[PDB]
Amino acid sequence: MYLFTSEVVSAGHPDKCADIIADTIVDILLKNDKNSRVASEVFVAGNKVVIGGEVKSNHKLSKADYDNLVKDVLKNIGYDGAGHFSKEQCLHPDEVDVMVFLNEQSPDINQDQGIMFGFASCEAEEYMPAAISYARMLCDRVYAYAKANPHELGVDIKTQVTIDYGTKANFENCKPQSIHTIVVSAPCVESMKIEDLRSLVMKLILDSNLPKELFDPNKTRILINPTGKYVNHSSLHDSGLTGRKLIVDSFGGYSPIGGGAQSSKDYTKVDRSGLYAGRWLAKNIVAAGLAKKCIVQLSYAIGVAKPTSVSVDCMGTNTSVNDDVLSDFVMQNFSLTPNWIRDKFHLDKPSKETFLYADVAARGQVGQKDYPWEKLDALEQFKKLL
Amino acid sequence: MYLFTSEVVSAGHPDKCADIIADTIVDILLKNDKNSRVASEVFVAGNKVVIGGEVKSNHKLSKADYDNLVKDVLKNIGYDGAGHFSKEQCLHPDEVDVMVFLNEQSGETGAGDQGIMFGFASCEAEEYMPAAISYARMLCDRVYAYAKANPHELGVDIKTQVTIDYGTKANFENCKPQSIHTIVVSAPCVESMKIEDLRSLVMKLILDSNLPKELFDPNKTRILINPTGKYVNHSSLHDSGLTGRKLIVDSFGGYSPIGGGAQSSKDYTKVDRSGLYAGRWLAKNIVAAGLAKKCIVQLSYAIGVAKPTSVSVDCMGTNTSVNDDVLSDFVMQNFSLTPNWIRDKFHLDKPSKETFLYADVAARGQVGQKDYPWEKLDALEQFKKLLK
């Protein structure tokens, strides 16, 4: 036995509410001024939504703009005030007060040493590692049910998956053996007994399309609302703050991590651009067949736009070329300057027909087929290495 | 030819002010009621401090008490309104408005939440820490100390970055740094101080720090002091801060994965805090015993379950003897790892000046200090039995 675990939380989780609100602001500003510099932090303290930070933009937001945006975000997440949950059980949009400390300033005239990582692996869907992939599948399925059935389930949902790899050697070779344990936490209406809640999410677990080679219900340990009573949920009972789900939003502990949060920020911060470029490179490398998994590490220096270096680590799973040759290829064939990355993924141009930052905030920064930094448009260039 | 960089910020950084305020609340509640349950998050911006989250304690805290706590914390961090910086340039205690938007909450004792946590250790630097963050930390501590004693010159919102050259990937994997490639220090100074003088001052502090001579040569290492030039404005007055937004700086500086869960704001029943301390303690004892050059320990929990749902160790290929399967089994079989076991192992419910204080840990980093109970090598002999 050799175990590894990852977690995911839904868009209804308080920290995600804060992330989705913050990146709704980013989207609005960028839609109207592409060169907006945004650092918009959100603290959902119960029924108090506190928006702070700083924005340099030509687009300005009124108090009503903030009120509308918060209510529309909460509604789309699932906090629509239908009243299946009492307003003391669950956040009700009417009870919210929005408090704005956000500082607006004019754009600067003509508007770091560090590292960022990306990662990819062949273990599971969209080249993501196993534990977080399967935790995401379960969460997505329970959240989707809760939205369709607010009379039964609430939208503040967490999941956790433990994978048994058997031996460390299988972990190194990307060879998961079984899903060992599944944890699901989902709130339900006051009138639903715990036995009936467990029966429901058990059905949802089986309908989450988990691979049968890994998942046997009879041999898997399943823990559903283990404390036995979970009705009260949302930011009312657990504070939410922006940038507090770094690992559920990325690689679930399978990769080292540097820098800081994506949400709250525009594309000019390497916390965004470096993660997206790093992930894009890693995904295309594994998708090309050069490795079973790899970690891509961008390094930046003061006074250079181009990264001082980019290093590829295939963690011993190389098929064709060693890590030195691969790193050299990457540095020589991709500029990877902030502006090149911006233009490569169109990061200054979020739109409903491409990607939205509020959408990525809700679904994960990495690991969804439709994002631009998840496109396999470098595959032909990498295939030249074999 | 193989670069790596970590960064540290001082207690004067807005995110750290938030962390330290939050953990000052944890300290006073636990001091007077050891079963207090605390999730007191903090947001700081401009002249505002907002406290939210949940608290359950027999020690009652008034609005005046919260106000006074906030001002006292800010004063001890170094924002004391002495007048070297104006109330427009950095935070003055007498100008802050405090809002308190707190609610109520909602081994045999089950874990307080699900989640994952990682401990890490490495034989590279003091106290089994990796090099770049160790040296970054050393420099930041030194500059912050100087600033607190000379507030007529420097502000206390400080940042340091250290870039290590390893030479090659192989050396990085075997914990062999070759040189410090770059040192970056950023500090505010008072309006009257010329940039040249700020730089002269900081240069001395770097040169007289205890950096190893093996790695540091002041004629080969590039030293950058205030890359964007002079600035006077600093503190949360000018950039917002939030609890739990320095998780990498407070731990392993890029050399390890993290769980994602924060430490500051929380009592010891939150496994996001306690599981980091237990992971780190295991990883440190494993490396100090000579079983690996570096080690990552993963723990996970499920809400309402006491025993961890998973325990795994990863020595990143650096094992000297036993493999990672045997190590993971040994840990599982010899250390209970329930919340109560962790609480009792490190006496987390009994903070004190002579042991540890949460607010002090917030300001000094969550790991890497000799005096923390989870930095003690008291499992050393147990792990040395695996050497054969």
Q: Which residues contact B70 (CB under 8 A, 6 or more apart)?
A: B21, B49, B51, B96, B98
Q: Which residues contact A142 (CB under 8 A, 6 or more apart)?
A: A10, A153, A157, A159, A184, A186, A201, A204
Concatenating the DSSP letter of every residue in A85-119 gives: S-TTTS--GGG-EEEE-PEEEPPPTT---EEEEEE
Q: Of B161, B304, B324, which is closest to A226 when you measure between CB atoms?
A: B304
* B111 to A109, A223, B1, B108, B263: CA distances (angstroms): 52, 13, 45, 9, 15
What gap in Å lies between CA A356 and CA A367, rounded to an integer? Answer: 15
- On whether the CB atoms of residues A21 and A70 are closer than 8 A, the answer is yes
Q: Copy the structure tokens of residue A196.
A: 């009936």
What phi and psi values does residue A350 have, to the nearest 5 degrees? -65, 140
Q: What is the CATH number of domain A9-108+233-269?
A: 3.30.300.10
For the A112-129+270-386 domain, the top CATH level (class) is alpha beta
SS (H, E, C) A116-169: EEEEEECCEHHHECHHHHHHHHHHHHHHHHHHHCCCCECCCCEEEEEEECCCHH
Please state at what angle helix A338-345 crosses helix A270-287, rounded to 10 degrees: 60
Residue with tokens 């805090």: B273
Topology, domain B9-108+234-270: GMP Synthetase; Chain A, domain 3 (3.30.300)
Among B131, B141, B130, smallest CA distance to B10 is for B141
Cα distance from A371 to chain B (closest Cα, Å)?
23
- DSSP letter, residue A241: E
Number of A:B CB contacts under 8 A? Answer: 196
Strands of the sheet with B3-9, listed across from one edge: B3-9, B159-165, B179-186, B222-225
What gap in Å lies between CA A175 and CA B320, rounded to an integer? Answer: 25
Q: Is A118 left (phi over 0), alpha (psi -120 to 50) or beta?
A: beta
Among A41, A29, A24, smallest CA distance to A348 is for A29
Q: Of B52, B114, B257, which is closest to A239 when you measure between CB atoms?
A: B52
Query: After which residues are there C–N gaps above 2.5 Å in chain A?
Result: 111
Q: Is A239 helix (H, G, I), strand (E, B) or coil?
A: coil
Q: Is B235 helix (H, G, I), strand (E, B) or coil?
A: coil
Q: Is B311 helix (H, G, I), strand (E, B) or coil?
A: strand
Concatenating the DSSP letter of every residue in B107-145 gives: --SPBSS-EEEEEEEETTBGGGB-HHHHHHHHHHHHHHH
Instruction: Give first-to-last CA distance, chain A, whole Å.
Output: 35
Among A310, A314, A313, smallest CA distance to A301 is for A310
Cβ neighbours of A236 in B, within 8 Å = 103
What ranges do the domains of chain B cover? 1-8+131-233, 9-108+234-270, 113-130+271-388
B324 part of contact set with chain A, CB < 8 Å: yes
What gap in Å lies between CA B340 and CA A304, rounded to an integer? Answer: 51
What phi and psi values does residue A363 have, to the nearest 5 degrees? -105, -10
Tell me which architecture the domain covering A1-8+130-232 has in CATH: 2-Layer Sandwich (3.30)
- What percent helix, strand, coil does chain B show, rounded to 5? 35, 20, 45
What gap in Å lies between CA B44 and CA B239, rounded to an integer? Answer: 9
Same fold, B9-108+234-270 and B113-130+271-388: yes
Q: How many CB atoms lie within 10 A of CB A108?
A: 9
B240 part of contact set with chain A, CB < 8 Å: yes
Q: Copy the structure tokens of residue A99.
A: 């408090």
Among B232, B237, B228, smallest CA distance to B85 is for B232
The answer to whether the Cα torsion of B40, A361, A357, A298 is positive or negative is positive
Please state at what angle helix B14-32 crosses helix B63-77, rounded to 10 degrees: 130
Q: How many CB atoms lie within 10 A of CB A109?
A: 5
Give the angle subtended at the CA of A280 by the CAs of A274 and A281, to the nearest 5°.
90
- On whether the CB atoms of residues B121 and B294 are closer than 8 A, the answer is yes
Query: After which residues are there C–N gaps above 2.5 Å in chain B?
Result: 106
* Model resolution, angstroms: 1.7
What phi and psi values does residue A185 have, to the nearest 5 degrees? -120, 115
- On whether the CB atoms of residues B296 and B118 are closer than 8 A, the answer is yes
The answer to whether the Cα torsion of A256, B112, B282, A170 is positive or negative is negative
Among B163, B136, B152, smallest CA distance to B368 is for B136
C-alpha gyration radius of chain B:
21
For the B113-130+271-388 domain, the top CATH level (class) is alpha beta
CA max distance for chain A: 64
* B130 to A74, A126, B161, B340, B380: CA distances (angstroms): 42, 33, 14, 30, 20
Among A159, A166, A257, smallest CA distance to B296 is for A257
What gap in Å lies between CA A130 and CA A3, rounded to an integer? Answer: 12
What gap in Å lies between CA A59 and CA A63, rounded to an integer? Answer: 14
B360 part of contact set with chain A, CB < 8 Å: no
- Alpha helix (H) ranges present in chain B? 14-32, 63-77, 131-149, 169-173, 195-207, 271-288, 324-334, 339-346, 358-364, 380-384
CB contact under 8 A, B116 and A313: no
Cα distance from B151 to chain A (closest Cα, Å)?
26
Q: Which residues of B37-72 are buried (b: 16+ CB within 10 A; e: fewer)?
A: bbbbbbbbbbebbbbbbbbbbeeebeeeebeebbbe
Beta strand pairing call for A37-45 and A240-241: antiparallel
Q: Copy the structure tokens of residue B266.
A: 């929380």
What phi and psi values does residue B290 have, to the nearest 5 degrees? 90, 15
How was this structure determined? It was done by X-ray
Q: How many helices (H) and strands (E) does chain B have?
A: 10, 11
CB contact under 8 A, A43 and B260: no
Q: How many CB atoms lie within 10 A of CB A9?
A: 23
CA B8 to chain CA centroid, nearest Å: 9
Q: Is A305 helix (H, G, I), strand (E, B) or coil?
A: coil
- DSSP letter, residue B94: G
Cα distance from B354 to chain A (closest Cα, Å)?
32
Answer yes or no: CATH 1.20.120.1200 is held by domain B1-8+131-233: no
Among B125, B135, B173, B275, smallest CA distance to A256 is for B173
CA-based nearest residue in chain B for residue A164: B310
Cβ neighbours of A228 in B, within 8 Å = 304
**What's the burial of B11, exposed, middle or buried (CB within 10 Å: 0-12/13-18/19+)?**
buried
Q: Which residues contact A205 (CB under 8 A, 6 or more apart)?
A: A138, A141, A182, A184, A217, A222
B103 part of contact set with chain A, CB < 8 Å: yes
What gap in Å lies between CA A51 and CA A37, rounded to an integer? Answer: 16
* A9 to A126, A346, B36, B106, B386: CA distances (angstroms): 19, 28, 26, 19, 39
- Alpha helix (H) ranges present in chain A? 14-32, 63-77, 130-148, 168-172, 194-206, 270-287, 323-333, 338-345, 357-363, 379-383
Among B293, B277, B279, B263, smallest CA distance to B347 is for B277
CB contact under 8 A, B247 and A246: yes
- Alpha helix (H) ranges present in B150-210? 169-173, 195-207
What gap in Å lies between CA B105 and CA B325, rounded to an integer? Answer: 39
What gap in Å lies between CA B209 and CA A250, rounded to an integer? Answer: 37
A2 part of contact set with chain B, CB < 8 Å: yes
